[model samples]
Target: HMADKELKFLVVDDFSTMRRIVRNLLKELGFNNVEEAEDGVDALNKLQAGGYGFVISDWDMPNMDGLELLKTIRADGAMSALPVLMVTARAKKENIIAAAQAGASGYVVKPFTAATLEEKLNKIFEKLGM
Candidate 1:
């Protein structure tokens, strides 16, 4: 469904391994234009530079967390509409509700499969009519 879209993705995580894993999975899913950020602050800096279509962020990180990043994006007029997908290990009901309320385009719990990622992306695209 996302084959023709020239989507640029920002993968944010404190761990290099997680970033690499996400990037690799995205690449495997036919999304080659993926970038990585070590934390929310770095992700925000890159977002400010523009050209990003989506964000996949981790909840726990030093400097800035994913929840803060989501709030920041929602508050910024320019980036408010940007699609953000939170990829986290926090799978509690409250966490999921808070993320959805905070404006996350989608949420994927960690240790997920490529199918789960594809499903979330498809839903986001459908919602956005992309």
Candidate 2:
């Protein structure tokens, strides 16, 4: 009941398979209002279209990466405080710290399970009082 099922999510990943997996997992969590973006550039474009409540992005992409995307979202005045969850294969400490520095709301390493995703999402929601 604490979770917002109506919150629209933007799932950004270069690979269609990963995006589908994230979207399906979110759907299982009762968040069916989701959209997909191929990379940071596409993510920003869709975000500008407006009404997205959350972002889940991958690290390495063609035009822009998750870190860059997070930074951009944080820099924007309108959606600067929007929640962005980093979901990437970059398990290195440096990468995690970089995402943290860039102001990512949460981070989830790749090959993660639905349970982990749910935990991270709920933690963010609780912290934000969403």
Candidate 3:
């Protein structure tokens, strides 16, 4: 899992507890270089500075939502190719379709397990040839 170990991750969520949980889960999955962002805006700020290999964002948030963030990332030339894995509570087919159309690298519903997270990350890595 060298790719997992080497990749730097950003966990974006409004809830601090959720961020901590996701961070801890990533750490357990062999990813230690993880950072937390309170919302999409915060995540984008950090992303501008570079070094973020992946983004795991929640759908609902203040000061810029996940979909807007995804659009921004996809539109930006510098970060257009960045991998974003949306970890959201919204599991409706419409929401999933929107995310896919918006260029999300992957999607995972809330209350997911460590195995699911790991599986998503691995799939994203494989897709991007990381």
Candidate 4:
């Protein structure tokens, strides 16, 4: 199944520049319902406010990181099944393994192309029957 075009997305990154970049990328992909958070704590607050359907997050940040955010989401019953796609520069084997163990729905490394983003999103959408 195709992913919902209206699906709300929370893009978490410590850098405002990166957040804007990701938001633009998502917009180019036809997803306009996007929000940004500076860190994992901020992300969680917005998430608790509800309406978030997907998360595209950076791995490193102040206060909390993406892996911790993913773990918290997985442990929460209300949002455990929510899809989180890790988009970070951390491409080490252990980093990928950690994200997978934490239940990331998808992972895309930094310096990725728009096509790669679309491909990964489609793959995750297909896996989840979105």
TM-score-better candidate, 2 vs 3: 2
In model 4, the worst 10-residue window by lDDT is 1-10
- For candidate 2, list the clashing residue pairs, or say none: none
lDDT of 3 at 18: 88
Cα error of candidate 4 at position 22, Å:
1.1
Model 2 lDDT tens row, 12-81: 9999999999999998988999999999999999999999999999999999988889999999998999
Residue 129, model 4: lDDT of: 88
Candidate 1 stretches greater than 4 Å from native = 1-5
TM-score: model 2 vs. ground truth = 0.96
Candidate 3 global CA lDDT score: 0.90
List candidate 2 segments past 4 Å from native: none
Predictions in order: lDDT? 0.90, 0.92, 0.90, 0.92
Q: Give candidate 1's root-mean-square deviation (CA, Å).
A: 1.8
Tell me each candidate's RMSD, in Å, in order: 1.8, 1.6, 1.6, 1.4
TM-score of each: 0.94, 0.96, 0.95, 0.96
Give the clashing residue pairs of candidate 4, or none: none
Ranking by TM-score: 2, 4, 3, 1
